Every structure is written in structure tokens, then in C-alpha cells.
């Protein structure tokens, strides 16, 4: 600690940086005005990466309206790269995610960081010594109201591909399910009861429909982020940012993320309670909602063995009960409902901070960013979670299951073509009064023979 | 009163009374609310029109004998002509088994007004049977969906109107004060100016981007079902029934109906429910910041940040004027949050999918059209006695662009 | 449509008011203004019995002070007499439930009607000519500022005795059955996964058991409500309501509910509303938490007839298909499932009223209110629903909940004392082989008589 | 890193645990079993030490009854005690806050770290060096049922605990501000709109008067978790814990805690669902509430330089505004709001956690855990926060404090008991008319004088 160091001044004096750290002054002081969590700006899904390309989009548009140097410009489209490959200067944003201000302090940040990069580059000293200022050049032509949203915008929008990837790796993982108990006799249970003949193999493709309308859904309500902002303004009108520079920009965003962004609803509003993300969100949490119940299916339908619905079963990962052989707790189910009821009470978050918008401003943004970004994540692994660990183990009892299907009184219904309607009710009272079976009252009433009985119940 | 046969003995129902022993029954059961299907929302309206469309179907296809399959339509006339003999639906908001109760109660209303529009003794007269006829190749875990999405469908069409009409205020605002100075605020800090007249439109603006979502995800109720599942796949409606069921769903209600994607789960938990009450939250959201703003900016008289004066509805300080509370940006405030808490029932509801069917379909269902209600009426309430009636202060808006402490930013040159 | 009425004038000019009507200028105006819902100040769980009291107790310390005429306070009270009993003359509150101005619509409503009450009772033809002054006499020493919470917080309190009893109705309800299935054997399960063998008798002590501590939370929560403020804050400690009056009015308003009520510690805040309510609705959405977890295992243990968990009978009331019994829906449950998830969904509702709290005030008071009485009032029937017309004609059905214990895969764990521990872990292991049951594996290898086997199991 | 390792069995098979891990196959399984989060059992508000506190307490019993062997028992207890002497053996627990197995994966993390701690003390190898073991000695007469739970209530009832002294730490720095801005008037507004004048000082305490009730509450409701139910049920009642062991082993809690440790008031249920915890983060719901509220009201109070109310005015923490000036941001008013945003967000989470709840045993515990912690955590630092760098030196423009309370027509009022009622409403016309305040009102139209105008408006 204070070691080797670096003094770099602001409007608020003078302050030595930790030499090294790529982090200017800004960054140095919101290191220590906010202390809440942890977790600080360190990313999975983008965000860094996020800001770094709204730079480069921002840096290569700059230099071709020539609103500032080519010379200092393709030193900072460079020193993005340096950020972008393999990140040759990342995490370098020690900013807690908790953090006031909309994100002046991470726009502030990604600047920096870039700032001495390009200077680097340019083989100059970094931090006293700024020929590549950040301010008059990483971030020209912009304000973080503009660039800090479209930055968490590609982010988030990138971020939920990679879950649409997971959604869909979990998805085969449903349909290898299905296609292997294609055939395999299951009772549906409408309100608990039960209720007309089905396959397990048709229960299993059920979960990957349904996550099939999930992608769907979540690919759709994130193309409100698409529509991003750089060289927008604070307040009314623009300052010059507005010029064929705005859209110019963007044009370059475009042209790195590789995402079909476009210049925003306008210019106007905007920042302003932009809840695209409690769409974005909303989507999320319904995922949440679905692979929940998908998971609350799975942890019932493989409930109690030797003594409930014992139609499949869920890998046995933990430790076996030996002397009390009754277990194999449903694991993997639980830990992403845990995860779901998580992603959903996120929602309630988000919610809180677009209700919290305030005039001409709605800081309440990084909130909403790593709320949203979490979300993103846990869900992630939730799914690749209960696909490799969970969905590929599951085999089902056959036996209980077609017994299943045997053992129910409405499988009468079959027969009523050909015993008379008016039979089959007494065959069914009788059965659910004896306690016997379709099969079995049939069989002691004399209406039918074993070949003639045993040539249907087969579902259709 | 008249007696009507059924499983669990023979309850009677009195003769007036256009709904069957099902209904009857239902209303001892559930017993929760004091408000039964009060739809202001369309609602049965929607549920009316599923039957109709089944109907028609149903002729088109030789289900049942065209006289009671007219006898149906009929019926269904009578109630939609002008919305008629609605009252019939007596069953809780809160109610069990997906809202078998909503489906059932439909059957036999338009099973009665189906009959006497022949001449037959009103309910237990079973010439025009309700369950064979007017439920004929439908089922609760598809009807009843159906009548929801389509009913949801017309309520926010009605709600995007009122929302456009509240557009208009801001619109109308943001022309008329156009020409004053203004300084803008984010985080409540002093950024560069604006017209006071611009802020408004962003009001406009911002519902207006409102709007395109609402609809944008109430599209998403177009991918309906009649004569589905209640299992994985689902019995024999599947022939011309379903698409023909839906293409005569589309010409009744008038909305572009469309067979669903497939046939496993739908009444087994709809995200699309979700979506649409979340679009219905997002609303909320920002109708709710739009008013915080309005009672920031017609805050406290001389000493307290006043741009806008409000439309005034009450009591003034006698002894010396000294305030005109916010009272109906505030009340947009309680609905908004109203809806927004809705946003979790509809959660809780949407999330307790037992194995191949959702039994809380209803309570998404109240959670739903209760704050399309309040919404749709929020809109106005604010329209007509509030926004239609703000008036600026020039001098004080001009005012802080003037003493505007960094004037500067432009005067650097 | 317009048929004669009385002619009434505010601040704001003049307007006409239905004659018949008691709820004089502000509350005609106040209907108007806000057209939100239907519901207006329709409150079953005693709302205006609150407000009537509030005012009914103020007046009698306005009279004891003698700040107003005993003659007119003693028709703000004679008048409260009335409007009270099984809730007479009190039937003109008729404001939207959503209403601004942070109460002084509900109770300006209040501060009319016992005037014109008290006008009728005074020979004197009420309206215009205000001998009661709604505000001059009713109103005395007051704000909404304090009164509305007050009639609030009162009335809420009162709300939730009603609450507890049909609460404990419910208990009563578990626990006669907790008496009836006590020898019946079920095999307890953790995680879903089988646990351990208890009596079907003990899970539903564990119902009421739970509702009992559920609804200590309750009437726990509740009394802190009873702290209340009545005339005083505005801004800080309070106007000049001071001296005797403040704590002496919220003790005779002690008299008057027959509630324990005490000013609160201090006086600079419940303005800004108070986390008394997120409190109180706390213990509600726990209640609805509790509740729900009930009918999902009432649901759980009738799942299925034959195919299901099958362990429980719901009492059938609703359908009947005669040639496929393999039905009977769990539909009573399932109707408290969704009175839960809307009171639970006013958690919400409350919450983001609480926090919209700004400076001294917090002006969202009535949409805790009402979201306040909707959770208390539509959650108390969801018990009377659940025990009437669900729990109190369960049956069980023994022969299987006990053949889930007889037949569970590891209940050798008794018998390994008699076959030997390491006997044990080989037969509760060819069970699994096998399907077989403990008995029959043992009974089958020899390790034990039938006789030293059937007598032993139970517990 | 991957370099060294030792080959440890379970009921599964056997996979090579680290030579510097104290963890078993078990940890190892159930590090790799659930994979959601980068948050594995860090634990920064306490948790970890709670549990090795409970797990000591239990041998503080085993030892004395005798389920394990004086030696043994002394080597765990003694195991504990080095956890514990600072939290020095707490990294070995990287499992995710995000389970199932309901904290099968926490409880047994904990019952290996003490048990290798502890023959290890002995003498003994790390690894299955079995003279101690985890289950049969560490975990007697325990399980996941009554340690996780108990145990978990005690880390976050000593956690809350750091909290109030968070949010008294901050109360202090608020009163500090009463005390400061005495003399400092001001306009008290309701509903926005100027209502009447009083001190800022009074404002910052009403701050307080808000901050101290929430820790009453916090204080009250953290008095539930201390219901604990080591040794206790398994499915309906008590396996075979139960005896002297259970009341004993929490009596031994309750002194290595310090905590006065009570059982259940039952034993039922409260494994399968404990309500205390949707009532403990429901009190942590509040807290963030008010105080966000508060938050709120700074960020309000200081607003926009002579464009903006501009009462009090708050640190300069980021570098400021070059060209034009004009700003002084609520940085830190801002993430305050921010984290009470999570807190309410987790408290849906513990809620939907609280409802999932399943027969005999709620498995959601973790989450509800996850979700706990994760509040107790960042409320605390908020506090700590706020009060650090930015409610510690916050200032007041006196004169526009002063210029609102003068401003504002409402100051007639007391000079109405003066001038007479008729005399006090021209004024307030005349500057209504004018544009003028109650002092120059009353001054040219001459009622009071200098001295008498002077002589009265500081309260
Ligand atoms: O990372 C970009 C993409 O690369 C492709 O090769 C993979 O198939 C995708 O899963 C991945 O999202
Ligand atoms: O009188 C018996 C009780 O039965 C319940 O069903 C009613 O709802 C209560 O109001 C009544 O007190």
C-alpha cells in the first residue's frame, strides 16, 4: 500500500493514483465514496467489454467528423483492442457496482483506463501526463447519460444471448429426454388429479416448448435495447453532440458489437424512466417463473420412492442414506428454484429504481444494471446447471408409470364402444369401490375376454 | 324456483336465474370477495364470443343439430347486442379449478337464453343441452383461456385510447408552453436549459413509446386455442374444429385469433400473461415517475420549486393562500402502485403450474383486468382534472434559466 | 337524475349537494375527482366506525377541555353513538378508495356527516347552515395529519381481531382433525423424498400449530398500531393541540374502542406514513405465506385418486363425471392458493407507498389502506372458506398412508437390533432389488417370526 | 492450485479431497453439484461462525451425556474454538450460497472442517484419519433439520445486531445535526406544498426520531430468531435427539453465544418453515424503506443550486463541473437508494423462498439465507456509508431556509392572535394581491412594528 505510486490532479486537488492502476483519478475517488458490496465492476456477460466498444464506436467516428486528432483517435480505437482481445488491461473498473451518480463513474473509468492505454500505446507515460486527455478525446462528443446506457444496453443485449445459448443447450437436453421415453405410459395431473393418458416423452418435450417460447420471448423484448444512445444530451435539445455525429456514431457501434443497433425511439424523453429494461427484465424473470415450475414438476414427479409419484429420477449427487435407503433428494431442481425466486425478486428491484425516476434523469440506472446483470447470470447456470447435473440423468420407472396408466378409471372409456357406455360406469364405481381395476371388473363382470381386453389402452 | 339435475344431488335454482346449478353451487363454495364477474373490461363479452365462435364452428362441421348450434349463436347475440343478459355471472373473482366455474356458468346462461329464443321453458328444459351443445368439442382448459386472452385483448385496446387521450394533454401542453424558458434538472442538479414546453413532450413521447409496447406484447394473446389440451397432446377436437373454432373466434371478436403453436401447455401457465401484465406494469412504472415529476414541479408556493401551476380541487388556506395539493397526480400514484403490486400475484399465480394445467388462472385473471381498470381510469382521472388544466409560471421557469448559475456553458465565447 | 337538493358552498364557490345526502360540499367534490373504482369508503372491516370514533373520542376531550360548546360536543359524540352500533346512519362515506389528499377526503367525509347527523338530532336543518362546523366543531384540534392514521390504525387493529378468531376458527377446525386421523400411519417425507413415519393425525397438529404461532405474529404486530397520534404532527412535536388534550385524547379514545391505546414515544414522524403498516401487512403476507404452504399440501396429500399421493379426501362439492371417477378437484384450497398470492401482492402495493414517503409527509396513506383492508378482509374468509368448506370433512384413507410406512424401503431400521445392523442394510437393500416389503424380505430370508415381527412396527 | 491431493469415501466412491483441505468428499461434491453463482459461503456478516458455534454447543452436550467419547468431544469443541479465535480456519467452506439439499451441503462442510481441525489437534492425519468423525460424532444427534436452521438464526442474529450499531452510528451523526442547525427555521411541507415553519434542526432529528424506531423494531423482531430447535423432529415429532440432549445442547448454545437461546415453543413445523425469517427481512424491508425514504429527501432537501430548493447542501465527493458550474450531485444519497432497492427486491425472494415450503421440510432455507445475509450486509454498510461521506458534514444556507419560512404568506398565523382574524386576511389578500410577505404587508399597512414583527418567528 502506498508503494510505487502516481499523482494525478482534478477539480478536487490532487491525489496519487496507485501508479500502475490504469484507473485515473475519478476511478481512484469513487473507490472509496462508495463501499457497500464486494462485488465490483468484474464481469461474465460484458459490460467492460460494453463500454470499451461504445468507445471504439464512439473513438472511430470521432476521427472521421475529425471532431478530434486521428492522431490521439485511432490511439484510443487501439487501446479498445487492447481492452477487447484478450483484455490486455481489463478489470481495471474497482468501482462497487453500488454506485451513485447514473454511471459518471463508470463512464469515467472506461475513459480512463482507455485514456492511458491509447497514451501507452503512443509509448507516452500515463496518468500527470495525459497528450491523450480522456476527456477531450476518449469521450468527445458524449455524456454519460448517453454513454453510459448504450454501453449497458450491448452489454445486457450480449448477455442474454449467451443465456439463449444455455436455454437452448437445456433444450436438447429435454428433447434427448423426450425421444428416449417417447413411449412410456404417464398419467397427466390437472390440479393434482389425474387425468388423460400421456407419454413421459411428451411431458419432456412439454418443458422444451417451453422454453422454446422463453427464447423466443427474451430474443424479442431485447431488441428494445438495440436501440441505443450515443450523442444524445442531459436535459432538452443537445448540445452539439447533436449533429450528423449521433447517428454516425452508432453507425460504428453497429459496426463493432455486430448487433443491428439503431439510434433510439429519438432524442427526446429518453434517459428518463427508460424502462425498456423492465422488459428486458420482465423477460428474465418470466424464464424465472417457467424453469421454476419446470424444476417444481421435475422434484414432484420424482417424489417420494417406494411411496409417491416415482415416475423418474434425478441423479444422485450427494450421499447416500444407507441404513434409511429412502432418498435421493431432488438437488439440482431446488438450488434453481433457489436461483429463480432470486431472478424474480430482482424484478421488484428494477421496478423500484424506474419507479425512481426523477425529472430530466433517472439515475437509479446502475441498479438496474447489475440487477439485470445477475439475473442474466445465475439463470445461466441455473440452466447449464440443471442440464448437465440434472435433465441427462433422468430416467423414468416405466413400470410404476405405465401402471400408472392401467390402474386409472378412466381408461373405461376405451372400452365403452365396445361394452356400452352404461357398463363402463358401473366398471368404474365398482372400480372405485372394490378398489380393483378397469381390467379387473371388466374381467370379473364377464364383458369381456383378456385378448379382446388387452388389444387397446395405448394412448391416442 | 325450478330444480336442476346434477352429480351431487339435485340443487334447485331460482327459475329467473339464467345460469345452472353449476353457477348455483359455485356461488356457496367460493366465498371470499363481495365482487362476482363485475366486468367493466369485456370479460364475459369475451367469454360470450367464445361460445359464439364454437357455435359456428360447430354447425360448419356437423357437431351438433344446427337448430341448437343456431340456437346458440343466437343466444350469444342477445348478450353481446348491447351487452345484455350479462348479469348471470354470480361466481366469485375468486374461485377455484382453472375458472371452471367462468366456463360452466357460460354454457348454461346461454344454454337458457338459447332455449327460450325458442320457444322452450327456460334451465332445466334440456332440448338445447349446455354441456353437450354449447361446451360441445371444448373443454375449461381451453375455453376459458380463450375468453380471458381475447377479453385482456379488448380491455388494452380500450386502455391504449385512454392512454392516447392523456397523450393529447401532453401534447397540447407541450405546444402551449413551447415558447417558455426553463431550466432543466438531473439529479435534481442544475443541467443546461430547456422549454417548459419541451419537458411535456416528453410526457407525450414517453407514452407514446408507452403505447407501442402495450400493444406490442398484447399481440402476443393472438396465439389463442379452442378445443385443445388437458394433457400433452388432447383429444379429438383436433380436425377442423380448433383453426375453424379460431378463424370463427377472429371474425366475432373482431381480432386477428390465431391457433397457438402447438398443443402442450397454454392453460398450464401462460408467460404471455405475465408479459401483458408486466407491459401493464411498465405503464405503471412510468405514469407513476410522469406524476412525481408534476408534484415536484407544483410544489410549495414561491418557497418550493414552482413551474406549473395544477388544476386546484378542494380547500385554500383562508387566512392566506399557501397551497393547491397534487390530489389527482397523487391518486395516479396509488394506482400505479396498485398495479405494480399486481405484478407479483400475477407472478406467485404464473409460477404454480401443478404438473399440466395452472389452477390460478382466475387470479391472474382479476389481478389483470383490475389494473387495466384503475389504469385505463387513471389515464382520464389525470387527463380531465389534471393535466387538461396546468397552467406554467413563465417568469419562474424563464426565471431559473435566467439566474441560471453557469449561464456560461454557451458564454464561453 | 338531478331531483331536488340542497345548496352548499366552499373555498371554491358554491355547488349543490343531493339534500337527502350528509356528506356535505368537499366529500361531493372529492366523488367526482376521483373516478378510479367503483369500491368507495365501503369498508366492512370498520373503517368508519374508525373515523366516526376518532371523532367521537376527540370531541368528548374537546368537551372535557372544553375547547367547543358541551352543547355541540355532545351531538358530535351523540351523533358518533349512532353512526356506530351495528353501523347505523353511517352509509354517507362515499369516496373512491383511491382517493389523493392524503385522507382529508375521508376525513373532511367523516367531519361532515356527524355534523348534519348531529344538525337532524340538534332540530337544526343541517346543510349550509353548519351549526356543528365540520371543521370549527367537529374538526377541533385536529389534522388529517393525525386523525386519518388514528382511524386507520384503529380500525386495521380491530380488522385483524377479526382476523385472528376466524384464524383460530381454522385452528379449532385442524385440530378435531389432528383428533380423528391421530392412528392413522403416513409415511413423513422431506424434499419429497420419503422421510420418516409420523401420524396423519401429527401433520395436522402441525397446521394448527403452525396457525397458532401465526397468529401470536399476528396480534403481536397488531398492537403496536395501538401507538397512534392523535392531533399533533404537521411537521414536528405537533401545533398547539398541547397540554391534556393529545395524550388525553388518545385515552379517552381508549374508552371509546376499548383498545389499549398509548400516544406514540414521540411525535416527528408517522407523517411520513409509519413501518407499523409494512409491519402489520408484514405478518399478513406471512399469514398468506403460511396459508398457501397449508393448501399446497391439502392439494399434495389429495393428489390424485388412486394415482396420486391419494392420502386425504377433499370433501367434494363442485363436479361429478359418473364413468371415470378418476377426478375430484382440490378447488376450495386452490381458491385461499389465490386469496395468498393477492395479498401477498399487496406487499407490494403497501411497500412502494411507504418508501414514495417526501419531506414531512408521506401522501399515499389511503392506498396502504385499502390494500391494508383488502389483505385483512379477503384473507379472513379465506380461512372460514378452507375450514367450512374443505378441512372440516377431510377423510383420510389409512389402508395407504399406512401402507406407505409398512412398505417404506428403510423401516428395518428397527428390526436391525433384533437381524443385526449389517443383517439390516442387506434386506432394506434387497428391498430396493426387489419391490418388495421389509416384512417380506425378512419374512422371506427367516431373520424373523411373523409373530415377533406383527408384533412390532407402529409409533 | 490443483497440485497435491488425498483420497477420501462416501456412499458414492471415492475422489481425492486437497491436502489443505479440511473439507470432505462431500464439500468437494457439493462444490461441483451446484455451480449458480461466483458467491460461494464467503460469508462476511457471520454465518460460518455461527455454525461452528452451534456445532460446539453440541458437543458441550454430546461430551457430558456421552454420545461421544470425553476426548473426542474435547477435540471438537476444541476444533471450534480455533475457527473461532478471530475467525482465523473460516475459508474452508466454498460451497455456493445458492443449494438444494437444503444445507445437507453446509451442515456437513462444517461437521468435516471441525472434524479434521480436530483429530488433527489430536495427532491425527488430515483425511479419513476417522478418530473424530464428521457424521457419528461431530453431527450427534443433529441434523440438517435443526443445525443449518438453528445455527443460521444465530449468525444473523448476531449480524442485525452489528447493524443497529450501523444504524446508530448513523442516528449519531443525525442528532449531531439537530444539535447543529438549532437555530436553523424553515417551511415544513405536506403534500410538497409550503405548509408551516420550523427548525431544520428538528428535521435532521426527525430523521432519528425515524432511524430509532427501526431498530426498536429490528431489536423486537430479531428476538424471534432466537427460537432455535437443535436436536430436535424429523418428520412430525423428534427421532431419538430428543431427551435432556435437546434443551441442554441449546442451554450450551446459549452460553457460547451469549444469546439467550430458546427452543421452539413446540417442535414442529418451524424445519419444515419458520416464520421469524419473512418477519426478520421484512423488518430489514423497512429499514431500507424509511431510510431510503430519508435518502430520498436528502437528495431533495439539497436539490439544484438557486433552480432547486437548496436547504441544506451536501459533501463534494466527485470531481466537479469545469466549464459551467452548477452541480453537487447526491452521489451517495443515490447508492444508499440503490441497495434498499436489493433489500425489498430480496425480500420477494425470501417471500417466494417462505412460500415454497413442502410437507415436513422447506428446503429454501438457503436462498432465504443467501437472500439475508445479502441485506443485513449492504444495509449495514449504507449506513456506515451514508454516515461516512456525506450526512457527517452537510451544511445549510440558513438564510434560504430562513428565506422559505419568512417567504410563504402561512407566518400570518401568529401574528393573527395580535392583529385580530379580519385584520390577519387582508394581509394575507394584500400579499397575495401584491406579491409581498406578511413582514412588509403588516409593515406599510400598518398594524405591527419593527420590534413586534421582529420579536417573534424563531420556532
Ligand atoms: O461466442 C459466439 C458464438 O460462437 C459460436 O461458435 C457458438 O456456437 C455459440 O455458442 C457462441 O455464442
Ligand atoms: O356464524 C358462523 C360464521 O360462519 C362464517 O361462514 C361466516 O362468514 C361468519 O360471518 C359467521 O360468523
Redesign the interface.
Known sequence: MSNNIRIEE???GTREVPADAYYG??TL??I???????NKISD?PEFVRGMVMVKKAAAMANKELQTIPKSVANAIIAACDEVLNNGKCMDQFPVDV?????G??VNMNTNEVLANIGLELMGHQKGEYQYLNPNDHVNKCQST?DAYPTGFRIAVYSSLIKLVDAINQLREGFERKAVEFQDILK?????????????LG??F??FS??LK??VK?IQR?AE?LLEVNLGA?????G?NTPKEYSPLAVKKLAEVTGFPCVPA??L??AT??C?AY??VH??L??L???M??IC??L???????????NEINLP????????????????????????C??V?????????????????????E??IGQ?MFESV??LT??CY?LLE?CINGITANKEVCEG?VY????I??YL?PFIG?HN??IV??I??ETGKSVREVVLERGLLTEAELDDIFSVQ
Open positions: 482534478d477539480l478536487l483519478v475519478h475517488r469513487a472509496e465514496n462508495f463501499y457497500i458490496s464486494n461474465i453500488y454506485q451513485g451518480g447514473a459518471t463513474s447519460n398419467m397427466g395431473r390437472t390440479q393434482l388429479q389425474d387425468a388423460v393418458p400421456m407419454t411428451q411431458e418435450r412439454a416448448i417451453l417460447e422463453e420471448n423484448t428494445l444530451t442531459a436535459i432538452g435539445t448540445l425511439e429519438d427526446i424523453e428518463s424512466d424502462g423492465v422488459m420482465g423477460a424473470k418470466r424465472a417463473v417457467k421454476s415450475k417444481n414438476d422434484r414432484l414427479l420424482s417424489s417420494g420412492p417406494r411411496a409417491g409419484l444422485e449427487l450427494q450421499a447416500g442414506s444407507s441404513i434409511m435407503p429412502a432418498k435421493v433428494n431432488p438437488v439440482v431442481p431446488e438450488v434453481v428454484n433457489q436461483v425466486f432470486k424474480i425478486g430482482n424484478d421488484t428491484t428494477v421496478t423500484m429504481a424506474a419507479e425512481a425516476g426523477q425529472l430530466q434523469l433517472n439515475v437509479m446502475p441498479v440487477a447470470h445465475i447456470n441455473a446447471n447435473k400408472y390402474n386409472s378409471i378412466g373405461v372409456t365403452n357406455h363402463g360406469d368404474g364405481k372400480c372405485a
